Amino acid sequence: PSAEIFEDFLDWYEEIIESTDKRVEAIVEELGGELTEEMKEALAMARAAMAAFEKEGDVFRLASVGATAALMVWFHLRNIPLAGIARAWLLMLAQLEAGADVDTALAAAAEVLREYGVSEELVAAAAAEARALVESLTPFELASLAALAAARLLFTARNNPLAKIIQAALDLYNRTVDMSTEEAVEAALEAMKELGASEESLERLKELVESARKRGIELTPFEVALLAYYVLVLDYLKKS
Numbered sequence: 132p133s134a135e136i137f138e139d140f141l142d143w144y145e146e147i148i149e150s151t152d153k154r155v156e157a158i159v160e161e162l163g164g165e166l167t168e169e170m171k172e173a174l175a176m177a178r179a180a181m182a183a184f185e186k187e188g189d190v191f192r193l194a195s196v197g198a199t200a201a202l203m204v205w206f207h208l209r210n211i212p213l214a215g216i217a218r219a220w221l222l223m224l225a226q227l228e229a230g231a232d233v234d235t236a237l238a239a240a241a242e243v244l245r246e247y248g249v250s251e252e253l254v255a256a257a258a259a260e261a262r263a264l265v266e267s268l269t270p271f272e273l274a275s276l277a278a279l280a281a282a283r284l285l286f287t288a289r290n291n292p293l294a295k296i297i298q299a300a301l302d303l304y305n306r307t308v309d310m311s312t313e314e315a316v317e318a319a320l321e322a323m324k325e326l327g328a329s330e331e332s333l334e335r336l337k338e339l340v341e342s343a344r345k346r347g348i349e350l351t352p353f354e355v356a357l358l359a360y361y362v363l364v365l366d367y368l369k370k371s
């Protein structure tokens with residue numbers, strides 16, 4: 132059912148905030164359990180962050196935050212360490228928006244990962260790969276790039292193909308930092324071809340990219356790879 136949250140993010144058009152609030156409240160009444168103060172306050176942080184992207188017109192990051200909160204409550208009980216990945220991303224975002232240095236935001240992120248049942252070997256290993264990728268920048272890119280490196284190593288055993296999808300997007304981000312916009316769309320296509328992952332996905336990318344280029348400002352080369360990630364993941368989920 133996690134493919135529902137990815138499809139809703141891929142769906143483009145106050146509306147996104149009110150739909151996200153309904154989806155988070157839906158997952159709460161669909162999983163049954165009562166919400167704790169930690170998760171209640173993490174949701175308020177995500178709703179304040181997406182409200183900040185509203186007033187400044189960052190519609191891509193906006194729905195990205197709404198998807199993290201919806202996935203965070205979905206993995207409340209099913210996959211506890213994954214909820215740590217989602218909420219540590221939320222904490223890194225808010226702390227970086229408060230003028231934090233990278234080491235401080237990473238150390239506070241390690242606290243949250245440890246608390247939600249992530250082994251210290253993976254916490255330190257994720258803190259080592261994240262520090263290198265960060266020192267190559269918006270706080271959105273820092274929180275997402277670091278949390279992606281942590282999700283790859285936690286995906287030992289469970290969903291070990293999904294680590295490849297994270298691996299490629301990280302390698303794609305490092306190789307498209309100097310490439311142009313259209314050159315990065317070619318590279319994202321070429322990487323999607325290297326992994327295959329059926330067709331229709333290769334078009335879903337062109338749809339989302341051209342949808343962002345026809346209306347609004349054109350997006351960053353980081354956000355291209357972020358778009359290609361959501362297409363490949365949704366392909367893998369429907370394939371299963």
Ligand SMILES: C[C@H](CCC(=O)O)[C@H]1CC[C@H]2[C@@H]3[C@H](O)C[C@@H]4C[C@H](O)CC[C@]4(C)[C@H]3C[C@H](O)[C@]12C
Pocket residue numbers: 133195198199202213216217220275278279282293357364
């Ligand atoms: C792939 C994994 C689980 C997917 C699922 O089956 O629900 C999901 C769970 C939380 C997701 C992360 C969170 O949504 C936080 C980040 C959101 C960004 O838009 C992508 C990177 C980002 C770090 C996401 C990477 C990946 O999509 C994660 C780690």
